[model samples]
Target: IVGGYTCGANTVPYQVSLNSGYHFCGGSLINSQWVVSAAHCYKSGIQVRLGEDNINVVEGNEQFISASKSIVHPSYNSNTLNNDIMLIKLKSAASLNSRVASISLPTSCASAGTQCLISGWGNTKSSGTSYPDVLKCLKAPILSDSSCKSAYPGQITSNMFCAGYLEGGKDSCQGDSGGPVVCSGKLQGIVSWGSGCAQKNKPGVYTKVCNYVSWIKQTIASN
Candidate 1:
């Protein structure tokens, strides 16, 4: 999961540009018509790209999908980053091919301490420059409910999960926000926030995908 300044190999995965050539962080296809991403990633104009690795240079078999509508969680608040989840309804159904395929969303999330994979084009180091044109990923273990609760104080809500290296250094950065945190090949979480990119005792926070299964199902159905 990456966010902030774009520098990595991972493309915004969307066609919609924030600035002239900047893309927003978002999820890939879950079904032919739905894409899961952070509600904060929602903007006036955006496009999604599949089967591509680079945003600076298009080198893969990319499919640009126009968003017919973006459905953000009803209780989402940009100020506090609460309920930060959304589903993008593509103008047309995405076609599955050799490079493009939907990721599975977990019906149930793993227990605390489960190992998961987090990927994005975020900054390699906290307060460091962003990586260039290459998507990077790392493995992080889920934090126990009690551990995360103690770590973030009152910020760890039921809607969010925490994961990362507790000792520090290795973690997701700004550019990775709104990206995927996968466990057992299933979409378990969506990158949400952190104290800093890789701050010690301040692990990455994610939107709990399992908790929103019904919302996702309903949104996809309405699409």
Candidate 2:
């Protein structure tokens, strides 16, 4: 997270690091056995690490579990990064604790200008790979659809939205994809794409979580 600070242990209990031997993406646990992340982050042999604060340390609260299955949105368009949400079913249910709990799913869209928290171990700079060892968070306001469209022109879609400073210096970057964007104690977005990390008039784009609420719940119920 560019221009963000380290998060306290247990501050983000729902946050999880996606791994295949190393941290590659982030996700949010929505239930004991389900996680929400970007479809673009999907791959075989994925593992989830919950209750993590620092990647380099052995935190007793952490739980490492492999993914049993992943369901990418049926209409997901990889080229445009549209409908980028995905549901990951854990091989086993997580033991909920003070440092490992699920977050509520958003029932509706958050209003524009609402302040939200975006957290991850992504790059701290606008350029190059500099993923943090410790989890970091940035508080950014949700941008209006008009503002979001203006930032990306033809690139914006209803399935996606933008958040962060229009003037740059504070946004999620590489290694942050599939991370949570919590608004009003709910999982509202999933880190997806952008022009670059924290660039002016180029806020980070996120998969609109509210739009997939029904799909998420139905998928969980049927499976």
Candidate 3:
């Protein structure tokens, strides 16, 4: 996340590093074996690393696994970026431990103005060349639907939502795609896209997780 700082090591147990030869996106383990991320984060050679904070090097505590399968929503729109969520099945269930765990799915709706947390290995700047080796995070308030609509003009939809500062400075940026937007200890959204990082009055957009709970359950059951 741009304008964010280094996060405490392994504090977000559900958080994981996704790599396609190299780190490309962030992910969250929903269960011992299943991971949830943005469908657009899809890539070849995807690998999952749990309990790893500093992604630059290998760690003894990290549980590395291969991606067995990736299920994207059938109606997902790459252009409109609607239905932007996806489920990534790991080759094997990760061994649950103090530093490796899964986050809970939201059982309730996310409310506006609630402070939420986002973490990722994305850019430190909008036009930055390098991404942080260690995971980073920031806290931002969830924007109201009307406020978010005004921010993005015609992009906000039922499947999509927004969170961040209207004044800018902090947000999930490039390379932070498919990360977690956690609220009240529940998984609320997925980092999908943004307009040039953290621009003023333009908050980052995410896929609403609660809206796809049924689809996620069905896909996991069928696949």
Which is superior by lDDT, 1 or 3?
3
TM-score for candidate 1: 0.88
Ten contiguous residues with the weakest lDDT in model 3? 123-132
Candidates' lDDT values, in order? 0.73, 0.93, 0.89
For model 1, residues 66-173, the per-residue Cα lDDT tens digits are 788888999998877778898887788877755667778787877887888777666676775756455666788899988888888888788888898777878887
How close is every model to the real structure, measured as TM-score?
A: 0.88, 0.98, 0.97
Q: Which candidate is the best by TM-score?
A: 2
On lDDT, the leading prediction is 2
Clashes of 3: 0
The digit string of per-residue lDDT tens for model 3 on 1-223 reads 8788788889889999898778888889998989999899887678998998888777678999999998888999999999998889999999998899889988777988988999998888866567788889899888899998998888888988899988888889988899999999999999998788888988999899999888888888887
Candidate 2, residues 153-178, lDDT tens digits: the string is 99988888899999999999998999
Runs with alpha carbons beyond 4 Å of true place in candidate 2: none
How close to the true structure is residue 33 of candidate 3, measured as C-alpha lDDT? 89
Query: After superposition on all CA atoms, what RMSD does each candidate show versus the true structure?
Result: 3.7, 0.8, 1.1
